[PDB]
Each structure stands twice: as C-alpha cells, then as structure tokens.
Amino acid sequence: LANVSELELPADPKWELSRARLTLGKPLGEGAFGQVVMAEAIGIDKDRAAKPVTVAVKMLKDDATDKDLSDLVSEMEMMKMIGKHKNIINLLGACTQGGPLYVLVEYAAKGNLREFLRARRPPGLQLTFKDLVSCAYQVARGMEYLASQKCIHRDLAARNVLVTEDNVMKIADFGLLPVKWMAPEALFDRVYTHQSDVWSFGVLLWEIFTLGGSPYPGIPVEELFKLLKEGHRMDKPANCTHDLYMIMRECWHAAPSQRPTFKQLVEDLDRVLTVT
Numbered sequence: 001l002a003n004v005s006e007l008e009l010p011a012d013p014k015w016e017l018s019r020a021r022l023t024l025g026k027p028l029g030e031g032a033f034g035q036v037v038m039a040e041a042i043g044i045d046k047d048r049a050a051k052p053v054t055v056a057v058k059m060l061k062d063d064a065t066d067k068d069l070s071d072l073v074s075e076m077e078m079m080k081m082i083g084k085h086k087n088i089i090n091l092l093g094a095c096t097q098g099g100p101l102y103v104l105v106e107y108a109a110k111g112n113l114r115e116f117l118r119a120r121r122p123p124g125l126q127l128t129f130k131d132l133v134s135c136a137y138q139v140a141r142g143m144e145y146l147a148s149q150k151c152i153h154r155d156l157a158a159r160n161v162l163v164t165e166d167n168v169m170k171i172a173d174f175g176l177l178p179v180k181w182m183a184p185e186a187l188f189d190r191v192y193t194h195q196s197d198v199w200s201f202g203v204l205l206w207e208i209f210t211l212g213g214s215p216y217p218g219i220p221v222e223e224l225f226k227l228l229k230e231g232h233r234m235d236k237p238a239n240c241t242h243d244l245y246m247i248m249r250e251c252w253h254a255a256p257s258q259r260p261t262f263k264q265l266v267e268d269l270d271r272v273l274t275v276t
C-alpha cells in the first residue's frame with residue numbers, strides 16, 4: 001500500500017522524450033513489474049531523425065496502483081546506472097512529465113531466445129551449430145557486463161533473452177516454472193550471487209542446445225528438489241559436444257566458487273566459437 005501523497009516524478013532531461021514522438025501500439029506481454037507494449041518513437045535513430053523507430057514501452061498494468069510505479073521507476077534508474085551494452089535490452093528514453101510513466105527500451109523483433117529456437121527447429125511446415133554457440137557466447141557477454149556493473153539477474157533463462165531483427169541476443173529484465181533455473185543455494189537458502197546466475201546460465205546453455213527445450217522434462221518440482229540434493233544433473237543434449245557439456249557441468253557444481261565466472265564463460269565460448 002503506497003504513500004498517500006508523493007511529489008510528481010522529476011524529469012531527467014537527457015532521457016526525456018517528447019510525448020508527441022511516442023505512439024503506443026499492441027501489447028506484447030507482462031514481466032515481473034508492469035506490462036510491455038509495442039510503440040513507435042520518432043527521432044530515436046540519431047542518423048534518421050524523422051524515422052519512427054519501433055520500441056518497447058514499459059508501463060503500469062491496467063489494474064495497477066502507484067505501488068507498482070516505484071518498481072517501474074527503480075527499474076529505469078537501475079538501467080541508467082548499469083549503462084549501455086550490445087547484449088542487453090537498453091533504455092532508450094522515457095516520458096515522465098504530463099502523463100503516465102512510459103519507459104522506452106530496445107525492441108527485439110524475433111521475440112525471446114526460447115521461441116526463436118523452437119520456431120526454427122527442423123520440423124514444421126536453417127539453424128546451424130555455430131549459431132547456437134554464437135547465441136550462448138552473446139548471452140555470456142551480456143552477463144559478463146551486467147556482473148561487472150554489480151548486477152545480479154536472479155531469473156536468467158532463454159525466455160528472458162531477446163533476439164533482435166539482426167539476430168543480436170539481448171538480456172531482458174536485469175533491473176528489478178522458474179525453479180528449474182534456480183541454483184540450490186538460491187532455491188533452498190534464498191542466496192543470490194553472480195555464481196547463482198552462472199548456474200542459471202548452465203541451464204540456459206541446455207535450452208540453447210535443445211533448441212529451446214524445457215529443462216528437467218517430465219520431472220515435477222518435488223522430485224527436482226530431491227535429485228538436485230542427490231547430485232543429479234541433466235544429460236548432454238543431442239546437439240551438444242563434449243566440451244560444451246563440460247561447461248554446463250562446471251556451471252552446475254554444487255559449490256558456487258567452483259562454478260566459472262561469466263568472464264571465464266565468455267573466454268570458453270569464444271574458443272568454441274572460433275574453432276567452429
């Protein structure tokens with residue numbers, strides 16, 4: 001329950017977008033806080049000043065109080081503190097004055113990595129191995145950057161990586177059954193670190209190499225708790241090499257410090273990417 005009378009939100013001039021430039025469009029979905037809608041913003045592209053660029057707008061849900069407002073604001077402010085990187089969903093601007101809070105972030109035309117891969121599987125009526133490694137490498141770079149800015153994602157998964165028209169991987173919702181991505185220490189002991197994100201990254205690799213497969217298929221969460229404690233892990237995917245499988249397994253060491261850093265993962269993936 002929110003404070004009864006706060007000040008209207010202050011403007012940050014350098015990020016403020018004129019409302020005349022923004023035109024809201026079709027809903028895209030809902031994340032942790034608020035919803036996201038498709039929109040067009042004129043002048044976002046500095047080189048093409050008259051062109052309406054498609055963007056994504058974060059705004060309040062239809063049934064929201066202003067409790068949800070502080071969350072949306074916090075997110076925006078985190079994105080500003082974290083700064084820009086190729087492999088994250090970047091802040092593009094905001095409308096904070098004379099109407100609803102609108103937070104503009106980069107638009108990813110091809111949806112999330114899960115649905116990107118699933119849609120481009122061999123059945124239905126060409127995705128290569130290098131492409132899969134490329135995806136993993138790009139996600140690792142994104143997480144390396146975020147970790148370098150003291151950012152912990154807490155819900156890293158293929159569903160939270162977005163793919164642009166140019167096939168760029170972009171981590172989403174880094175500002176703040178998901179149990180299948182949680183590290184034991186996070187699941188059992190509520191502990192979140194960069195090293196818990198690495199576990200999640202390991203599960204993400206598995207997603208990538210099953211072409212957007214759901215992890216621990218056919219295993220209910222109660223079983224999962226037991227089999228994680230017993231030290232069991234997912235088996236190598238079909239499309240996975242031994243070296244890549246070893247990287248997954250290193251991500252799933254029970255002891256967090258024995259998991260590699262994202263720095264190390266980037267290097268590891270780079271080697272696999274370059275020899276392919």
Ligand SMILES: C[C@@H](Oc1ccc2[nH]nc(-c3ccc(N4CC5(C4)CN(S(C)(=O)=O)C5)nc3)c2c1)c1c(Cl)cncc1Cl
Nearest residue numbers: 028029030031036056106107108109110111112159160172
């Ligand atoms: C909650 C929402 O949050 C965001 C946050 C920033 C964004 N930037 N860009 C998007 C975005 C843009 C387009 C988009 N869609 C277009 C399509 C999915 C429809 N297909 S199609 C016709 O090409 O087959 C791809 N989905 C998401 C987006 C979504 C979201 C969605 Cl809807 C899907 N997966 C992950 C998340 Cl976190």
